[PDB]
Amino acid sequence: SQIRQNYSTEVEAAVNRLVNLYLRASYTYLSLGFYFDRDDVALEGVCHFFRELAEEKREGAERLLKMQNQRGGRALFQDLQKPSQDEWGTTLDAMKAAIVLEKSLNQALLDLHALGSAQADPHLCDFLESHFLDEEVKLIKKMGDHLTNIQRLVQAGLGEYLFERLTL
Amino acid sequence: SQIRQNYSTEVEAAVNRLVNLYLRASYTYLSLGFYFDRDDVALEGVCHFFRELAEEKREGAERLLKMQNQRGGRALFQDLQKPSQDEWGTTLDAMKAAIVLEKSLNQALLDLHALGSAQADPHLCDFLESHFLDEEVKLIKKMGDHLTNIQRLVQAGLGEYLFERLTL
Amino acid sequence: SQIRQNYSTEVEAAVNRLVNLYLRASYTYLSLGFYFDRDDVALEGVCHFFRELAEEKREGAERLLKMQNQRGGRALFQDLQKPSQDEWGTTLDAMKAAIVLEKSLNQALLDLHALGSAQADPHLCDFLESHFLDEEVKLIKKMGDHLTNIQRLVQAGLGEYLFERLTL
Amino acid sequence: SQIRQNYSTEVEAAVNRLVNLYLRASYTYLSLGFYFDRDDVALEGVCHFFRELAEEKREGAERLLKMQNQRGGRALFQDLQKPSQDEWGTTLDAMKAAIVLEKSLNQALLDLHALGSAQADPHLCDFLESHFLDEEVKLIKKMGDHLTNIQRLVQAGLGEYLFERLTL
Amino acid sequence: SQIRQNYSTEVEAAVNRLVNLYLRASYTYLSLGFYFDRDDVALEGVCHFFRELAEEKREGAERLLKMQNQRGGRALFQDLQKPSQDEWGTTLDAMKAAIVLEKSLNQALLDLHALGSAQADPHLCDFLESHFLDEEVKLIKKMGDHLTNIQRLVQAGLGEYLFERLTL
């Protein structure tokens, strides 16, 4: 590319893999959201929590794609694997699955940052630090807070209702 | 009638029967509402839920009556049978009875739609699709959601109070 | 009931009968209203007059039901008989039928008041005097006024049109 | 056409015929309107009633034409026959002629709907149900209501004046 | 008195006794309110419920006093006995005591009404019917509703907290 400067082939490829990871995460949160919209699950606050996360992850992918083009890299899309489950159990089960997922995304961001550092690519490092790293830390903290409160509430049915009503 | 066109005697009669079904449903929800207003029941949110439904069913009957006249059919009213119960038990009992009732109304709508289709009466089919079919589906979903939450909450007294306070 | 005080079983039963009378009256005015909406009758002002009365009688029943509960009585609903006619003739015929109906309701109110007086139930007497007795007198006067004007106008077709247009 | 999908040649042709029917109806209502504007007829309300209908039918033709193009069909216009009369008699005569005309248009819509159903063309069926079928039913009801009131008013001169003044 | 007309000595005396009853009730609700303000009781909503009732009963006494003077009777005040308890137990205990108290006041009103009726004193009867009788019925209904909800909630500590938070 005419504009490409200090943008390795390794970073370009890793950015494409991170895009796939973010789209997969968006898809997972779509499934989580609509599961909590089932008539036999029916926790609206939980549904909305995960649907909002689906939008956030999709937006993350789009930001990575915009950056790929700004640097002169080339987007390459792959098949998006379906989420790991069809049914997500309780709010506790779902929140545990969500924190596992966010930690996997955070680790991918940290690996990409390390790659950027090894490649002396300060624009990549700043891009990651400004739009992703702190957002992941804040989100993981919030999910941890939720998990603690859910666990404290487990008369499990009553607890799950109250958490949805009074926190989410 | 001078205006009557493509409106069978079978549809006209079925519209009159559906009017009676909607008025009966309105009457049932009136009884449900005032039961939850008893001093020894005292669940205001439940009372208001069912009183609002009474109004909605009455409005449905009125819409069917307006349509009957628009098509040149003739309204024929019958005795309205009293509701199936004098006392409705818990919120759970009442919500179960309500979903049974809505499903019976929905089936009547579906039967009328099938009759309309057999009679090649597209105005009837559209009328039903625009003002009744989707409203029944949405209402039945909402009642299903409520039933699931009520069931999750059954320390039954505490659960019933919390549902009334925080959902209804 | 824990709240019940100075509320006889005779008054409670008579209140339930009056509720049935008011619901029957509402049903009658529904039939009257939609008859005047027929394409071969087509007197919109007459239709609206009776549809508004249907709402007023229904509201009266609801007020009686609210009072029943406030006093610790128990609502008991019965079958609602269909209106006395399927077709209501002219505006004059309909207005004559309406005044007969209102006088029957007024007599029922007066009988209930007498029962209340015999039972030394001043709350009942005041309830009736504040929400029903004067409303019936005013409504019966208005219908009498209408009847006189309709009668004066009977070139019967022209008269019926003019009354609907210029009074109703 | 590059866009054409599930749009039979039979429906395309029937849509062109319906366009001609709607334009002919618009032309008829233009003639009706200006007849009531004659100095020796002079019923302004009647004139305005029919001129508004002329606009509505023209708008219907235009909607059918827009739909023809959306589906990839090709508009084909034919000669527009002049209205069936040069003079339209009384308001009663004119309203009778108008209801005959609307019923003919409604039957054409119903036939097109049946054709669409036979051709499994759900877009056509929905298009007809959303913009034409209910509008025809409402208009035919209104004309029936008018006819009944006109008939009740026939001292024919006085009646015709009063209807124009107080209804139209 | 120069203004006194149709106001018996029996009614005057009974009005003075009712004033003492209303002031005693105000005093009782003052005690109830401040008990729920204790640091070892600490139910703010319950405190406010009873403090508002203290004001309402005081206002009732003042209205009776105003009426006494309007009729030309003479206010005579007596010692006000202290409330029946120094400590009021749970919210349930307190609400039970409150409904007992209101029923005693209501019976006193009904007795005064009967006295008025025996003395042919229609101004007294109307005064009672307009400012006291319906207010007592509504208040007793509300307390009954509260009692039912409190009882349903008795994990007694949790129930008492939730009622105070979500109803009062």
Curated annotation (Swiss-Prot), chains A, B, C, D, E:
Its main location: cytoplasm. One of its GO terms (molecular function) is ferrous iron binding. It is found in: Cytoplasmic vesicle, Autophagosome; Cytoplasm; Autolysosome. GO terms for cellular component: autolysosome; autophagosome; cytoplasm; cytoplasmic vesicle; ferritin complex. It comes from the Eukaryota. Fe cation binds at residues 52, 55-56, 59, 62. InterPro entries: Ferritin (IPR001519), Ferritin-like (IPR012347), Ferritin-like_diiron (IPR009040), Ferritin-like_SF (IPR009078), Ferritin_CS (IPR014034), Ferritin_DPS_dom (IPR008331). The keyword Metal-binding applies. Residues 5-154 form the Ferritin-like diiron domain. GO terms for biological process: intracellular iron ion homeostasis; iron ion transport. Residues 52-59 are annotated as: Catalytic site for iron oxidation. Oligomer of 24 subunits. There are two types of subunits: L (light) chain and H (heavy) chain. The major chain can be light or heavy, depending on the species and tissue type. The functional molecule forms a roughly spherical shell with a diameter of 12 nm and contains a central cavity into which the insoluble mineral iron core is deposited. Interacts with NCOA4. Stores iron in a soluble, non-toxic, readily available form. Important for iron homeostasis. Iron is taken up in the ferrous form and deposited as ferric hydroxides after oxidation. Also plays a role in delivery of iron to cells. Mediates iron uptake in capsule cells of the developing kidney. Delivery to lysosomes by the cargo receptor NCOA4 for autophagic degradation and release or iron. Belongs to the ferritin family. This is Ferritin light chain. The gene is FTL.
